[PDB]
């Protein structure tokens, strides 16, 4: 289905009509993240078409991917920005995002970062009692009123939605609906510092069934009804992020952005609410491969290993979450290459350094290209310099099949800078 990375019957992987092998030969022989700029455009356009007729902000979650060129591109197409730190807000402003389409969320927002948010006029979510006290303090410091959204855990039916219900009892995020009156009384006490403009929920990540959005929005509209009846002017419902994509490339049918917005469309329109959505994964994940070269193939007797140049330093998701990302070769394998089971592992000093397990692949020769698919979200953004494996360069392919560098490779000199003069 319609993936921007396609294996044609010639046995070559393509991005936007360009062979990945040709792209690999044109850049340095080290691991790198490869994006389709058009697939970024297609992902954004699917949300824009889904929200047509609804007053809305598409809040791209920068925590997914903080490439400045990708952010400037999304901004150029009418995107807002969702931030979880002051530095993310500085990068959004540098990328040219409108502060009236920026939302600063978080369970531990620093007073420093809240002063920046108040100064720049962005939307700020309220996560806790200490959080609201810091936002009032940031208002007093900046001398600006802050536009706030209360982050509420919707009391979803635990027999229908056990994982979300339990998540609300165990998680560090959000306000229990039982404490709502405390927050409203506090807002009413600080009219100069606080303007309550809406309510916020965020329901999880990799959501593959949209019934949770339907059921949560019904509960969020009843909270907004109650808030409006107490005389607060509420104009936004932020339903958060979390729409999933297909990681398995096995034909699974996932809900679209249209399906997601169709669950809240009529209630939002009936209440004259602006809808904020906060997608990260569903905007950037499926636009990107982590591109590798095969170091070599080995066996310990039971398991076979394809050893690559890339590692848990660049891409930790499989190790950290036991997550599946799809793996395939870039080029036709030798005639006579045996298809069998491989763990795909990096050169890093521990057994947690794997990119995938139990994958049926043609035995690749040394130097063959290999990709980890759907590597656009929470991959580069979570990269380390473990084993002094310096962070990779990034490229993208444009509509004409031309290749542009969108991030410099990190160098060893960038490690040494930290000790300069010490």
Ligand X SMILES: Cc1ncc(COP(=O)(O)O)c(C[NH2+]CCCC[C@H](N)C(=O)O)c1O
Among 50, 309, 375, 397, binds its own copies (CB under 8 A): 309
Closer CB to ligand X, 322 or 420, in the complex: 322
**Is residue 170 near its own copies by the rule CB under 8 A?**
yes
Of 134, 282, 307, the C-alpha closest to 206 is: 282
Residue 274: CB minimum distance to ligand X, A = 16
Distance separating alpha carbons of residues 237 and 268, to the nearest angstrom: 8
**Is residue 84 near its own copies by the rule CB under 8 A?**
yes
**Is residue 276 near ligand X by the rule CB under 6 A?**
no
Taking CB within 5 to 8 Å according to partner kind, which of ligand X, its own copies, none is near residue 75? none
236 burial class (0-12, 13-18, 19+ CB within 10 angstroms)? buried
Encoded tokens for 359: 């994958």
Task: Identify the three-state secondary structure at position 413.
Answer: helix
DSSP string, 20-36: HHHHHHHS-SS-EEEEE
Encoded tokens for 150: 């209360």
Distance separating alpha carbons of residues 341 and 360, to the nearest angstrom: 4
Among 66, 119, 186, 235, binds its own copies (CB under 8 A): 66
Instruction: Considering only residues 175 through 214, tell me which ones interact with its own copies, judged by CB under 8 A.
Output: 176, 178, 205
Closer CB to its own copies, 50 or 239, in the complex: 239
Contacting range for its own copies; rule: CB under 8 A; set: 139-147, 187-195, 258-266, 341-349: 341-349
Taking CB within 5 to 8 Å according to partner kind, which of ligand X, its own copies, none is near residue 419? its own copies
Distance separating alpha carbons of residues 271 and 277, to the nearest angstrom: 17
222 annotated ligand-binding residue: no
Residue 38: CB minimum distance to its own copies, A = 19
242 annotated ligand-binding residue: yes
Residue 324: CB minimum distance to its own copies, A = 17
Taking CB within 5 to 8 Å according to partner kind, which of its own copies, ligand X, none is near residue 317? ligand X
Give 389's DSSP letter. -
**Is residue 142 near ligand X by the rule CB under 6 A?**
no
Distance separating alpha carbons of residues 113 and 138, to the nearest angstrom: 9
Distance separating alpha carbons of residues 242 and 197, to the nearest angstrom: 22
338 burial class (0-12, 13-18, 19+ CB within 10 angstroms)? exposed
281 annotated ligand-binding residue: yes
278 annotated ligand-binding residue: yes
- Beta-strand ranges (E) seen in 127-250 are 146-153, 175-176, 194-200, 236-238
CA angle, corner 245, sides to 237 and 235, nearest 5?
A: 5
Q: Which residue is nearest to ligand X (CB)?
A: 280
Instruction: Considering only residues 267 through 286, tell me which ones interact with its own copies, judged by CB under 8 A.
Output: none
Closer CB to its own copies, 270 or 300, in the complex: 300
174 annotated ligand-binding residue: no
Q: How far is CA 174 from CA 223, 238, 336, in A?
A: 14, 13, 57
Closer CB to its own copies, 247 or 395, in the complex: 395
Of 222, 239, 139, the C-alpha closest to 187 is: 139
User: Hey, which residues are catalytic here?
Assistant: 349
Binding mask 294-323 for ligand X (x = CB under 6 A): -----------------------x---x--
Contacting range for ligand X; rule: CB under 6 A; set: 33-41, 274-282, 329-337, 411-419: 274-282
Of 113, 110, 109, 115, the C-alpha closest to 139 is: 115
Contacting range for its own copies; rule: CB under 8 A; set: 84-92, 115-123, 213-221, 256-264: 84-92
Instruction: Considering only residues 131 through 150, tell me which ones interact with its own copies, judged by CB under 8 A.
Output: 131, 134
Binding positions for ligand X, rule: CB under 6 A: 61, 64, 82, 105, 202, 205, 240-243, 278-282, 317, 321, 349-350, 377-378
User: What residue numbers does the annotated binding site for pyridoxal 5'-phosphate cover?
Assistant: 242, 278-281, 378
């Amino acid at each position: 289905f319609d993936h921007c990375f396609k294996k044609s019957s010639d046995g070559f992987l393509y991005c936007e009509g360009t062979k990945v092998e040709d792209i690999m030969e044109s850049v340095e022989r080290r691991p790198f993240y490869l994006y389709s700029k058009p697939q970024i455009t297609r992902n954004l356009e699917a949300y824009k078409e889904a929200l047509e007729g609804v007053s809305s902000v598409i809040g791209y979650a920068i925590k997914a991917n903080n490439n400045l060129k990708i952010l400037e591109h999304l901004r150029s197409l009418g995107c807002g920005a969702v931030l979880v730190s002051g530095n993310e807000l500085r990068l959004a402003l540098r990328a040219g995002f409108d502060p009236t389409k920026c939302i600063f969320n978080g369970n531990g927002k620093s007073l420093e970062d809240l002063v920046l948010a108040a100064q720049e006029g962005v939307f700020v979510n309220v996560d806790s009692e200490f959080d609201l006290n810091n936002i009032v303090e940031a208002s007093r410091i900046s001398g600006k009123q802050v536009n706030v959204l209360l982050r509420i855990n919707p009391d979803v039916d635990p027999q229908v939605h056990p994982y979300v219900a339990t998540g609300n009892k165990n998680s560090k995020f959000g306000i229990r609906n039982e404490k709502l009156q405390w927050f409203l009384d506090q807002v009413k006490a600080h009219p100069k510092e606080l303007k309550l403009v809406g309510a916020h929920c965020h329901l999880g990540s990799t959501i593959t069934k949209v019934d949770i959005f339907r059921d949560a929005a019904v509960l969020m509209i009843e909270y907004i009804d109650e808030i409006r009846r107490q005389g607060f002017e509420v104009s936004y419902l932020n339903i958060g992020g979390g729409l999933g994509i297909d990681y398995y490339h096995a034909g699974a049918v996932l809900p679209t952005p249209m399906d997601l917005i169709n669950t809240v469309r009529e209630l939002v329109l009936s209440r004259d609410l602006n809808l904020i959505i906060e997608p990260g994964r569903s905007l950037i994940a499926n636009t990107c491969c982590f591109v590798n070269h095969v170091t070599g193939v080995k066996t310990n007797g039971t398991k076979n290993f394809i050893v690559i140049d890339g590692s848990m330093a660049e891409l930790i998701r499989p190790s950290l979450y036991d997550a599946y990302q799809h793996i395939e070769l870039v080029s036709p394998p030798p005639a006579e290459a045996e298809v069998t089971k491989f763990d795909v592992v990096g050169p890093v000093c521990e057994s947690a350094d794997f990119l995938g397990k139990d994958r049926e692949l043609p035995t690749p020769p040394q130097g063959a290209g290999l990709v980890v698919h759907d590597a656009g979200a929470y991959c580069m953004s979570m990269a380390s310099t473990y084993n002094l494996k310096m962070r990779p360069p990034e490229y993208w392919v444009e509509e004409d099949g031309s290749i542009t560098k969108i991030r410099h490779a990190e160098t060893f000199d960038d490690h040494l800078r930290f000790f300069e003069g010490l």
